[PDB]
Amino acid sequence: NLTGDIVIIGAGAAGSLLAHYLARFSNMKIILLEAGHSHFNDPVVTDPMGFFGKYNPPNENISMSQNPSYSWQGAQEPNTGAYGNRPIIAHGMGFGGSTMINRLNLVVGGRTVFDNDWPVGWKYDDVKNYFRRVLVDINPVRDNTKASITSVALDALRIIAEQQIASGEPVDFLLNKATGNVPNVEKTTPDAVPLNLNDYEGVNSVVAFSSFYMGVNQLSDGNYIRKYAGNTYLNRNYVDENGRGIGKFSGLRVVSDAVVDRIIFKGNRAVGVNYIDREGIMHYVKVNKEVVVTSGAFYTPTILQRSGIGDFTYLSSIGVKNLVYNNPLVGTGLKNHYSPVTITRVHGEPSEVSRFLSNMAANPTNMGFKGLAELGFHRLDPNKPANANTVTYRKYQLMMTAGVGIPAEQQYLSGLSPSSNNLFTLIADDIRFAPEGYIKIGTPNIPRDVPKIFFNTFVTYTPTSAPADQQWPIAQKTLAPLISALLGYDIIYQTLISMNQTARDSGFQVSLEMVYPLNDLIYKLHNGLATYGANWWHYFVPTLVGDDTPAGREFADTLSKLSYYPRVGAHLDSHQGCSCSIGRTVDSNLKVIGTQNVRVADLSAAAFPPGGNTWATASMIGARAVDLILGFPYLRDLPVNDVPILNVN
Amino acid sequence: NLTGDIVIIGAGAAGSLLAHYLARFSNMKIILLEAGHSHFNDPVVTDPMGFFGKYNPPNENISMSQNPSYSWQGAQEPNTGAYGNRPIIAHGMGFGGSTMINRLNLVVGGRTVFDNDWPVGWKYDDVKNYFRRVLVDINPVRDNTKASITSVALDALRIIAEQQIASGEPVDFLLNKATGNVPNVEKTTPDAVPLNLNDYEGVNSVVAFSSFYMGVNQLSDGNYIRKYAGNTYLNRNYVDENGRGIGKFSGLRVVSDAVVDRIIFKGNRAVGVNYIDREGIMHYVKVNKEVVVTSGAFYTPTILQRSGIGDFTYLSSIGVKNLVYNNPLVGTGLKNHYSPVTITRVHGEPSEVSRFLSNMAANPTNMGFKGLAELGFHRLDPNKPANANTVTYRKYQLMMTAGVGIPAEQQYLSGLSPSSNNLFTLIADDIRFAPEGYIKIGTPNIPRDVPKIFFNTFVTYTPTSAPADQQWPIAQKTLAPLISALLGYDIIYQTLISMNQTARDSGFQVSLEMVYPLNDLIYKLHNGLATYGANWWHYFVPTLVGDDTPAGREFADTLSKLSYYPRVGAHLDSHQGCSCSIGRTVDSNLKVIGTQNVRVADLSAAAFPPGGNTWATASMIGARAVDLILGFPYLRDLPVNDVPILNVN
Ligand SMILES: Cc1cc2nc3c(=O)[nH]c(=O)nc-3n(C[C@H](O)[C@H](O)[C@H](O)COP(=O)(O)OP(=O)(O)OC[C@H]3O[C@@H](n4cnc5c(N)ncnc54)[C@H](O)[C@@H]3O)c2cc1C
Numbered sequence A, B: 001n002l003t004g005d006i007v008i009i010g011a012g013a014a015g016s017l018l019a020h021y022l023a024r025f026s027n028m029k030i031i032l033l034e035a036g037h038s039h040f041n042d043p044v045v046t047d048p049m050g051f052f053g054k055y056n057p058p059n060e061n062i063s064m065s066q067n068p069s070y071s072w073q074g075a076q077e078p079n080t081g082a083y084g085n086r087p088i089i090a091h092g093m094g095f096g097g098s099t100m101i102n103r104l105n106l107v108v109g110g111r112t113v114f115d116n117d118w119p120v121g122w123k124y125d126d127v128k129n130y131f132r133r134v135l136v137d138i139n140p141v142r143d144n145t146k147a148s149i150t151s152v153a154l155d156a157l158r159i160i161a162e163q164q165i166a167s168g169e170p171v172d173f174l175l176n177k178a179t180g181n182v183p184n185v186e187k188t189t190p191d192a193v194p195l196n197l198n199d200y201e202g203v204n205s206v207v208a209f210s211s212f213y214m215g216v217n218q219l220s221d222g223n224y225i226r227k228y229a230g231n232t233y234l235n236r237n238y239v240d241e242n243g244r245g246i247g248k249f250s251g252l253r254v255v256s257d258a259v260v261d262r263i264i265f266k267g268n269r270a271v272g273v274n275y276i277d278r279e280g281i282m283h284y285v286k287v288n289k290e291v292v293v294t295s296g297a298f299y300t301p302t303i304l305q306r307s308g309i310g311d312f313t314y315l316s317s318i319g320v321k322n323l324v325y326n327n328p329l330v331g332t333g334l335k336n337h338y339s340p341v342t343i344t345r346v347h348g349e350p351s352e353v354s355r356f357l358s359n360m361a362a363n364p365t366n367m368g369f370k371g372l373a374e375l376g377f378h379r380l381d382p383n384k385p386a387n388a389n390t391v392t393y394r395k396y397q398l399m400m401t402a403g404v405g406i407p408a409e410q411q412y413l414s415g416l417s418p419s420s421n422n423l424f425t426l427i428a429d430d431i432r433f434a435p436e437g438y439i440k441i442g443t444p445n446i447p448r449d450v451p452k453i454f455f456n457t458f459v460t461y462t463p464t465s466a467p468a469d470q471q472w473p474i475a476q477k478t479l480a481p482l483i484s485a486l487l488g489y490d491i492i493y494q495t496l497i498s499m500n501q502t503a504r505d506s507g508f509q510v511s512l513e514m515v516y517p518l519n520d521l522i523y524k525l526h527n528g529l530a531t532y533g534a535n536w537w538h539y540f541v542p543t544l545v546g547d548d549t550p551a552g553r554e555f556a557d558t559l560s561k562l563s564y565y566p567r568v569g570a571h572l573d574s575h576q577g578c579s580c581s582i583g584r585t586v587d588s589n590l591k592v593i594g595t596q597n598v599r600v601a602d603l604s605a606a607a608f609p610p611g612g613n614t615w616a617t618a619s620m621i622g623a624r625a626v627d628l629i630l631g632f633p634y635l636r637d638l639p640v641n642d643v644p645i646l647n648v649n
């Protein structure tokens, strides 16, 4: 049988890095088991434009995230806050994990989140040397082309930031403490210097920029290739076609097309793993030292539960025979991101509006991301951290995209046909999303694509027969996402109001207004904010604050109407994590509480979602697990000029 | 280990009956493999009202169809005809298959379908005995609490039938060929004899009645029970707690909590079956004579495909190792039913309207169904069989229910809240629904909840650069479902128009006007149908017709607006089948083409969907397969008085 010291389950954004840098620096046998197989010769994945449906048959025009042959299909239970919808969120299958099917963006997360929201031993100064290693291994690139809309938006944001600085409010969405009174907005001159948002020292927390960073590499021919975990750490230089290492890496052995279900125990120690190959044959893998599980946010708690780690009552209810430890917290507290969307129309003569929206197409260099800014807390938002007036946090990730990002049903309902050529998309992402859920298994026989996922986004609050004063804190806690989404809409509105004058100044004779969010409603919401200030959100429950005045009814009706759009006119991001975070299931050394020699090293073990995209954080967790297992800080001391070599075929 | 003579996979609506009567009438060892366990002591399933959520926890309020512990979650690929959404359809998991979580509505299917759409040897005179056996074994009951608007609707239908008969059209939705010139509308007299829609001779193909037949049995205590296949054929009288037969059924052996993946062949003949138990240990079962697969419409083709039966090219591409027989037709031609929904509002004084909609609440005997008729083709339907001038066909199933059956999003959008006490629902279910699809697997490792399911219903038509004279037939073939939906709306409108006068005559002083589908649009549709006759549907493509008058533009606009409602304001029925039909995957004796000793005996092996619900048809397939396997007409000649004995506990 197969025998080895360390067994890694799941070759995702962290498993590949862990296996690579663990086989390099040691001499013990390593086995990596992955559900899928390699895709180095598949044009759909390697080409960056294969993400947008470039090599798909006419009768099967679906993306990789909706394809069962590329990803798992984690259907969730009905959403009580979104009219009982059941969105599908996917995890990749094969070498590279979910990074094989993603947008290839890279955001670091910032300094404030790690300093304030993560436990001791995982502060920014302890993880920046691994962020640097991950970034230098991926080696992303910036945008090459540049449109005139970016400069106009940057100038409008600069004017807004100057106004906010002069106003003197302690907290705003365009203030940064580490810079001072100078707005942190890129210059619009042709010879300007870019403002990197992934700075080593984390100076840029609320920064307006001109470009993102995409994980692509230009090839000697002239085309681009997708740079992800699979071809970076598990390419032909290190792993051959038999799943064996070459040279120094001869210790590592990779098994392909192997789905695992259980971990065998001798009471407190893992002693084996069982999996099934392509012929339906059950195989058993001996474990000598340790087991590391990196199956992702959705499927790590399930494999933990069906092995006998969780609530004993429910596990005996469903029918688990072998039980090991009692953690009623396994699989609880799952976090994610959300992104409401906005559409804008441009008015004027066809020639000027055609010159205005030019040079904003999509190429493997930008992936449709013009990129505007990372924003802070709106001054009217009541739910802020305790020291939000001292250190600046990240809440919004502003983005700009061509075309219209809207489900076809809303496209028909609103009348904004994508065939039009005078519309563009602004998105105010939320990277501090409040709702939390949990995961439980349904049947204790085999891995299944659909466990029980509960995740309610925009719920409503029901009044009770109590004085309003003590009820208000409950309503404030319950209605956070709605307030955040509406304040993001207001942010976009102010940006458009400033950008009208900015564009008129820059030499474009055009005008702009919102169209999808029913500009009348946005204008009324802005007026209501301006006239009500801090207590504006009390109108979400008009019964307890009844004005008996036409203005009050008007504001309540407008707030009720605007609550409809974030439920349907938006989409969920596939940035789920924190389901098995540190402090609930594992300690600071990534060891499962109650056992001896098993560890979790994926995004599920994250204490708090990073302030942005989540590719780099999982790789950082894996890199830290490397020298936690080894015991010596090899990666933290590895020279920067040492990077893995790339083999294409 | 385990050895036997016949191995049955899946104890569904057909496997239960087949195993029961095959163990009764023979002397050979029989093994039944099921992926679930008995629910005889679970109030959610045994109580008929548990379907609506009578015993659900407040924080897990989900129906049995949406619960992963009760059913398989069959997610499908985006539907290009309904704005690209992915509805979820389930098969029940446990003793009784999908009959354990269904609405318990029993419809035989009709006679014309089995006389014009099934091969020789499967005509109505060869299946009526098995239909009678299934019906007497289940022993349904009729509704006990008769309402008042049922009589009003029946009188309106009688008036419409009189008008249609006096007119002289060859075909319409209230003409029955096997009844003469007398309308087939049930009497409204106090002592009226019931009209049975499941009659032995099949004379009622277009019949208007007052109550359906549902599978519930009244206990001596007073409360009702759910009488499905699981407790009918697999109760404690016959199968013990371990899973062994009792007395005469000593040859049976039932294995619970067993999921199968493979069928082991020896070149052309099955020799074994593999399954995984609750503990997670792979087991092997020997086969001596026969293997029968009854895993359902979705999951029987998957089992066949990953076993080595199907398109060799795709199977080899996805990694299937062993290939047995090449047949690219496996998993093709999937059919299902679609039910648009209509909402009506009643006007009048509160007392009269309150007493008008009385005695229509849902109780365990009618389950919210009052039932109207099995209607026929509309006179203006262009896509109808040529045989329709001699025989009558079932196309529309008409049902009524209190409250509003609408997704919450459309409930909010249309302004029709469920709190109103003056609304009721009319549903015209399409039972000759045209579109078809196919099923493919993604990974050759283990059974999965989500394989590739393609099903596109409301696809539109794009004109080409050709003369209209040859373009018209293709457009006529493509646009059938929209035509059927609009004609159903017109049928409901006519029924309401007649019901207004009938109610005003019967004593009530009220007015009924349809609301949800935007009455003005329906009025315009009715006027346009009357004006344009047979060629009304030509205006789905206003460019190709060449009409430019304001009337033509208005009619085209109305036809465009109305097409929005069927896509979203409806829900797909779980009556899927015909994916391994007779003559394409199996012969007339249910043996799989190209193989030696395996058969399929479920709803997937049906040649054409019946005119109504599909439980009885699946049970009939199983019952017929019983005596085909045995070779003697045991069940056809069994006396009607010999029925199984119920054993609740
Ligand atoms: C469509 C999409 C777009 C995204 N875009 C971005 C983006 O722009 N920026 C960003 O930062 N992040 C993005 N992400 C998220 C990013 O891809 C992941 O967060 C990241 O890969 C984290 O990796 P992980 O190891 O934690 O999880 P995964 O990469 O999902 O790890 C799962 C791995 O484990 C394997 N596995 C799972 N279950 C089993 C099992 N039972 N047995 C064996 N193996 C198993 C899988 O085959 C896979 O190899 C996107 C994700 C998706 C789905």
Ligand SMILES: Cc1cc2nc3c(=O)[nH]c(=O)nc-3n(C[C@H](O)[C@H](O)[C@H](O)COP(=O)(O)OP(=O)(O)OC[C@H]3O[C@@H](n4cnc5c(N)ncnc54)[C@H](O)[C@@H]3O)c2cc1C
Binding pocket: B009, B010, B011, B012, B013, B014, B015, B033, B034, B035, B036, B065, B090, B091, B092, B093, B094, B095, B096, B097, B098, B099, B101, B102, B103, B104, B105, B106, B107, B258, B259, B260, B261, B294, B295, B296, B297, B299, B447, B574, B575, B576, B602, B603, B604, B613, B614, B615, B616, B618
């Ligand atoms: C919500 C709902 C309501 C319905 N209402 C009605 C109604 O009112 N009237 C009506 O006539 N019909 C109704 N139906 C449909 C009806 O219940 C089914 O069509 C009928 O049971 C068909 O029987 P079958 O054996 O073909 O499918 P099923 O009974 O669903 O057969 C599936 C069986 O196979 C087993 N199985 C599947 N895969 C495997 C595997 N890999 N290994 C082992 N076992 C496996 C399952 O555990 C299950 O026992 C409804 C269905 C649903 C979902």
